Design a binder for this molecule. Structure first.
Ligand SMILES: *[C@@H]1O[C@H](CO)[C@@H](O)[C@H](O)[C@H]1NC(C)=O
Lengths: 42, 49
């Protein structure tokens, strides 16, 4: 969170930045389930 | 890419996913090739196909 720019923070930070093959996500929580009908492609 | 924000969306399947798609069609090339339609399966010996 240190060196930002543009507009303000869209942060509801309270638990861990998830490391993903698409990088890292703030807000998600780690889990291992199965979905064959995904509607939000991350 | 970042010099003017040229973000590339990765294809929405990981490489293993369409790898398994290709695997399924490689298993089903004989498996469709005996009868019209997509009802049954035809996992015959491939040479016989
Ligand atoms: C979830 O935890 C497992 C256990 O170490 C890890 O292998 C996986 O990368 C984690 N996934 C995320 C999104 O943090």
């Amino acid at each position: 969170s240190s060196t930002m720019s543009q507009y303000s923070r869209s942060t509801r930070s309270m638990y861990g930045p998830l490391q993903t093959p698409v990088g890292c996500v703030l807000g998600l929580v780690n889990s291992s389930l199965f979905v064959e009908d995904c509607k939000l492609p991350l | 890419q970042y010099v003017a924000g040229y973000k590339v969306l990765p294809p929405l399947m990981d490489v293993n996913m369409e790898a398994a798609y290709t695997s399924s069609l490689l298993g089903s090339i004989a498996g469709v090739g005996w009868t019209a339609g997509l009802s049954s399966f035809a996992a015959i010996p491939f040479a016989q196909s």
